[PDB]
Amino acid sequence: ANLKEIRAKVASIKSTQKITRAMQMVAASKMRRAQERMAQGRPYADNMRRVIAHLVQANPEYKHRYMVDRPVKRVGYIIVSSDRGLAGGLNINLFKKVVQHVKAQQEQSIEVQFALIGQKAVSFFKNYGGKVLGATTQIGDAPSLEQLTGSVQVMLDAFDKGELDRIYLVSNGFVNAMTQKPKVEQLVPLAPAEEGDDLNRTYGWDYIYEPEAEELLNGLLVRYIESMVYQGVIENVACE
């Protein structure tokens, strides 16, 4: 029978369930706190989009590479995930979808290059092998601008040499407080999206630039894509 140990085991299970629900409250509090950073990433992108829209409208003579498309033979991927486990089926379903995507790409006789963020992702990607271009770990609650330069830097310096053509991103879609849908969108082959603005309200004047506009423009694109990576990372943290 061992009845005494039955009451002891019941008490232990009750205590562990209580601490489990307490950890649930802590996770909810962290989720809310992270959700509070959902709004501040957009104004930077808005201003950057406005200024480059004016820049291309005023000087529509040089078609730069970062918003043009050429025949595709190589692509790049970016993965952001968790540093530990017990985060639900988020990372594993995300990786199932991305492996389906790359398998679909494989039939076109094109391979992939990628560098990721997360211990689980490096572990599971090394458990099956592939081509990696960097690694990161131990980011925690607060990612920084400096902590997330390596991945975007390697993507940029790989694309600028013509090795790569298009770069996607892989994250989780925080549809609302308790939903999730994975997403995949391009970053580097910047396609014209919502570019009809600033046309009807065009300005007959133009800004003056002490240097040539090229360095300013490509610095602006760099600003845009670091905002992309920052927004994706914080959105994934909030969803996770």
Partner: protein, 128 residues
């Protein structure tokens, strides 16, 4: 005793409800943190030695001091020493009030004002 027991009752209840939150103490909200601190302080206040038959005067003084947050600043480790020193100082200095309380057990505005004034005095004159 009847009019002062409710504070310790609710304090112990709220401390027992959230006893599992005493392992983080890092990012919990302000109300929960204050409740945890007060629960720890009151549960350390109930510490009692042996062969120390407290009367009702010192019990009332200690309970009233704990109720109004007049012992919050005291470190949890030295709560027993602070309580004992406060009781001893009150016994040495404020004897007539103790005799009146022990004899009748009545409550009044005057008694509460005198007890609070004595606690405010002890906050500075005597060091534990």
């Amino acid at each position: 005793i009847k009019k002062l027991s409710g504070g310790i009752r609710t304090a112990l209840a709220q401390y027992r409800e959230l006893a599992a939150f005493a392992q983080f103490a890092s990012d919990l909200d302000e109300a929960t943190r204050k409740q945890l601190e007060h629960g720890q302080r009151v549960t350390e206040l109930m510490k009692q030695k042996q062969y120390a038959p407290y009367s009702i005067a010192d019990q009332a003084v200690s309970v009233y001091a704990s109720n109004e947050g007049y012992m919050a600043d005291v470190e949890v480790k030295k709560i027993v020493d602070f309580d004992a020193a406060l009781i001893a100082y009150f016994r040495s200095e404020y004897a007539p009030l103790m005799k009146q309380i022990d004899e009748t057990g009545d409550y009044n505005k005057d008694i509460e004002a005198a007890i609070k004034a004595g606690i405010e005095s002890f906050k500075a004159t005597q060091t534990y």
